[PDB]
Design a protein around this ligand. Structure first.
Ligand code: 964
Ligand code: MG
Length: 283
């Protein structure tokens, strides 16, 4: 494929940092006024990772509608994603409120609760079935129904209950547990297989609200997940799969949330993920 030849070109010339800088310079810039508001300071994890106003998800409460989350709407691929930060101790209720209101079926987690000896994420789901979580601020109940631990990922069945109305929904929690503390994975095989597993569950399908994807900031590994999935979908859809430009898709995604793909090594990994992922469907 012509993407692999472009990949081999940048590899031989060692210009991954230069290509990544080009994207960084070309990337969209939009206001994040609501995010920067002083009352929303404790709702943000990082000062430099904000949702654009135009694509931000609004909570259905008149008090404070703010959550650090962006709707990425891919028109041509017919796919939507919510990218958000790993919830904070104070925003765990907000997080599940969004899952409920947006009618999400799947939650994709691409980090461990602890990485590099620091807390990257609040423990926002129950670890034992007998110990449910109740979120008093958003009036929601969350129960672990089942857990399936595998070598590279863990899938959890969760029940989310709106306590005001008593409706229940099954939420699928897809947790990629083997992303290395430093850098990117050596082989995209595990990541791609994880992707296919999320796909197979119907969590990315149009009959459901957009999947909720997060890592620490919801931009680095989260960007990779959405970029790979969209590129692969487009190669299936288009007349001429070679016309899929990963850089062009990324820049289109960057219109909805900042900083998707954080390093040149993450971009290289994305290429590899798309290249290897295509080879699984095209032999
Ligand atoms: C002032 C205030 O309120 N905020 C206080 C914190 S604001 S400064 C934080 C320091 N800057 C960073 O390194 C950011 C850069 C952007 C983002 N990077 C990643 O996505 C990432 N980080 C860690 C591990 N993996 C990744 C990955 O690539 O996915 C999160 C970390
Ligand atoms: Mg037990």
């Amino acid at each position: 494929m012509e993407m692999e030849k472009e990949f081999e070109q940048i590899d031989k010339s060692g210009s991954w940092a230069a290509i990544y800088q080009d994207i960084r310079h070309e990337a969209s810039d939009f206001p994040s006024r609501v995010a920067k508001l002083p009352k929303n300071k404790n709702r943000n994890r990082y000062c430099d990772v904000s949702p654009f106003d135009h694509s931000r998800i609004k909570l259905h409460q008149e008090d404070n509608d703010y959550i650090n989350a962006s709707l990425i709407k891919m028109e041509e691929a017919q796919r939507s994603y919510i990218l958000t930060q790993g919830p904070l101790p104070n925003t765990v209720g907000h997080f599940w409120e969004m899952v409920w209101e947006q009618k999400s079926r799947g939650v994709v987690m691409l980090n461990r609760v602890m990485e590099k000896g620091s807390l990257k994420c609040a423990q926002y789901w129950p670890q034992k079935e007998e110990k449910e979580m109740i979120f008093e601020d958003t009036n929601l109940k969350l129960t672990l129904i089942s857990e399936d631990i595998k070598s590279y990922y863990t899938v959890r069945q969760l029940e989310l209950e709106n306590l005001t109305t008593q409706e229940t929904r099954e939420i699928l929690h897809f947790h990629y547990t083997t992303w290395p503390d430093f850098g990117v994975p050596e082989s995209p095989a595990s990541f791609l297989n994880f992707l296919f597993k999320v796909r197979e569950s119907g969590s990315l399908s149009p009959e459901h609200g957009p999947v909720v994807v997060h890592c620490s900031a919801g931009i680095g590994r989260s960007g990779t997940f959405c970029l790979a999935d969209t590129c692969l979908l487009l190669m299936d859809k288009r007349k001429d799969p070679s016309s899929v430009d990963i850089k062009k898709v990324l820049l289109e995604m960057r219109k909805f949330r900042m900083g998707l793909i954080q390093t040149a090594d993450q971009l290289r990994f994305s290429y590899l993920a798309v290249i290897e992922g295509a080879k699984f469907i095209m032999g």
